[PDB]
Write a protein that binds this ligand. Sequence first.
Ligand SMILES: Nc1ncnc2c1ncn2[C@@H]1O[C@H](COP(=O)(O)OP(=O)(O)OP(=O)(O)OP(=O)(O)OP(=O)(O)OC[C@H]2O[C@@H](n3cnc4c(N)ncnc43)[C@H](O)[C@@H]2O)[C@@H](O)[C@H]1O
Ligand SMILES: [Mg+2]
Lengths: 214, 88
Amino acid sequence: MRIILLGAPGAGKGTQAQFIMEKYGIPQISTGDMLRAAVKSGSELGKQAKDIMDAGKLVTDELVIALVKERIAQEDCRNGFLLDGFPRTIPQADAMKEAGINVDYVLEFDVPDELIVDRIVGRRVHAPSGRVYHVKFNPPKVEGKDDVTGEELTTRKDDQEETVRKRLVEYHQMTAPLIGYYSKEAEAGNTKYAKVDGTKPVAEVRADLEKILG
Amino acid sequence: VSSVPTKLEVVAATPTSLLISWDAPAVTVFYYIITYGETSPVQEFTVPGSKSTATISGLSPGVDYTITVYASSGHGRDNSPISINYRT
Ligand SMILES: Nc1ncnc2c1ncn2[C@@H]1O[C@H](COP(=O)(O)OP(=O)(O)OP(=O)(O)OP(=O)(O)OP(=O)(O)OC[C@H]2O[C@@H](n3cnc4c(N)ncnc43)[C@H](O)[C@@H]2O)[C@@H](O)[C@H]1O
Ligand SMILES: [Mg+2]
């Protein structure tokens, strides 16, 4: 089972990725998490990527393609996988098609920009795993602590409204063309496409995706 | 038939814009594809599979339009649509 999550940064892809992971037994592959690990490494390229991420811009195509190809060749990705935030440009999608990486579903999250900017205010993360909560719309069981480890939750410093809006400008310029790209693939029978209303509460977006999937 | 929407109607209008509504088909809808053009290039857009309404704008007043709604099962225009003709 192979799935691509498509949508604006902050539309809720990582939140719903966890349920899909838990139910089909496939790993989540988040290029953002992979890049954050590269930053925490401390290479010059990790530093270069952190400077690009801090400005709300995309890292170079060829770098992220190479990181994904390495990640999907691992033993835990045999039975399938969920791509979260990749591909992110047309050249990234073309690299997948040219390499023969087919997928079963492409799932588009429909959320308006101003609602995204609103939601990120309350986001909290468990940094080591990257798990994501919201103080109102998806709170942890006991305040400020990750649910299955008990360690503290934190807030990313790259979640300033200013950086959020820069990611959204990047998204509409660079990433939204993938909607038309995969709509054409779906019309050719190369994957199934679906569009979900991501403005609903967390539990209802999950219920709509359960209806689509199988 | 189970994959074709029914009862497509214009439910609100201005001289240049309108809102359409339909009864969803029986199948699970992955997304809808909506097309419209003068009854000239045809325009197309999508809405989530959970919706049963859509807005169309930029219409010329007093002109006849054909509006078509496809419910997709995941493979683009893979089910037959329902259409309506409407003069603004
Ligand atoms: N392929 C690539 N190529 C080049 N560069 C790349 C790249 N991939 C990554 N990068 C670089 O890495 C950077 C970061 O990438 P990435 O890590 O992917 O972050 P992002 O693009 O900013 O997307 P987010 O993780 O913030 O949003 P999300 O959709 O997962 O929503 P979430 O579940 O967290 O939810 C957001 C909040 O809302 C809450 N929420 C979720 N769902 C709901 C709901 N239904 N209702 C109410 N609240 C909800 C959540 O609890 C949470 O608080 C990029 O900017 C780029 O620089
Ligand atoms: Mg995410």
